[PDB]
Amino acid sequence: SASHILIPASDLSWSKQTDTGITHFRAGMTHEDEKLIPTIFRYITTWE
Amino acid sequence: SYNGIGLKSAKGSSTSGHVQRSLASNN
């Protein structure tokens, strides 16, 4: 999985202007049971 | 309320469109 993730949605009218920061989260993938399915970005150590 | 945030629709998005405020971003 890579999409059971809250997607950052932040104010597209003012997001083109400056970097708003993460102010709100859009839901990524839905379903009755609560996912919590991990994503491999937590399992791959970053380049820096 | 749709305060400039979220989606135009949840039809072609393949999500539910559920928006919740980031409790982390406050100050």
Added chain:
Amino acid sequence: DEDIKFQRENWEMIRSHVSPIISNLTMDNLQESHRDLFQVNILIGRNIICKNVVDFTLNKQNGRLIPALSALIALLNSDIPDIGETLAKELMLMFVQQFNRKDYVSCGNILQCLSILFLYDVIHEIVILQILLLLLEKNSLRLVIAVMKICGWKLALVSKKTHDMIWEKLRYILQTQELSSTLRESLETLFEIRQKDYKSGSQGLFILDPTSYTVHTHSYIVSDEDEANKELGNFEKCENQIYDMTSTNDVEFKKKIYLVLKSSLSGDEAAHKLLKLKIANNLKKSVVDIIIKSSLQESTFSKFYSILSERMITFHRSWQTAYNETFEQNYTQDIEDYETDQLRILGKFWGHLISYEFLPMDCLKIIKLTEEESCPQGRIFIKFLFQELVNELGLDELQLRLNSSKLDGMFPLEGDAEHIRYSINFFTAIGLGLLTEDMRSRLTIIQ
């Protein structure tokens, strides 16, 4: 006579027991005061216990302690109806005397007592309303407001039809008739409390359950000659579990924080999911421990756990205490277990929060650099801490914060040149020796 002697100091001590109990009567002491009052012979000191309530009520120092007093009377009236029977009589006559005396100070002291006794079901609503009819027959309006502010909540519940008629005549006062000014704004304040529904006259000591108070609602009216039994207060002469060795509740909780922590993309997402849970304050020390242990499974430092912890701290102050407690709990206790691959993750973790002022520099005062109070894995943790301080701040900005820290515990400045020789030896071994210019001046003076 020794029998007249023995009965008199018995009468004296019963009088000298009730009077300090009433003077020590306050909220959260009522049950303890009523217990010691019960062992003293209440029935022999029947008017003694009544008069000590009346005078402690009347004295004008009280008035505040009246709902503490009337709650004791309900306890007595539940236990012995005759005590509240006689004590309701005297308060009726104390009203009718001072209403005839026009002692407005002493009337309101009795009327606050008669109100809260009606709140505690000691007396009937009949004894309240007939007082109201006498006061409203004259002006008497300063007295009647302090009654209806306190008792009108209960009284409209019980006797609504007649109580509406009391309001309707009382409304005819400030509507079709001229009134004195200072009295007038108090009367309309009662109308203001009416719309606010009496929520500031309905708080007291409801200790007794409505079936634990034996319901002796005394139906005495204030037009009855009430026997005035002062005489019994005089002296007379009686010729008469499975133990929990496992923590599976914690394990299911420790699994839930770990699943939150791995299902998130960014650190702001994991921060939001942890704050969404509304974790109770006893667990918020333990949630920091799950974060730090999961940061050591990563086998390399990540900025994920930094920006996770930064959004925790700026959210509420109890998280900021939880990181401050954990940093002491890590350095003083957990260093002995950690491998050197894990210490470089933590020193870069705590060096990141300290260098951006999420933890203050005063948390560094705990760390002390000696030969005795220093573990070999502890010095490794200091090395990877100061490197993140150097890389973020720079060598000059770190010089300014360490000067404002006055944490000599770190760099001494006086005391045991063997520690000053130790601390210079350690800091130059890290590679940062530009800070140690203060100690070298102090060291050569000792030589």
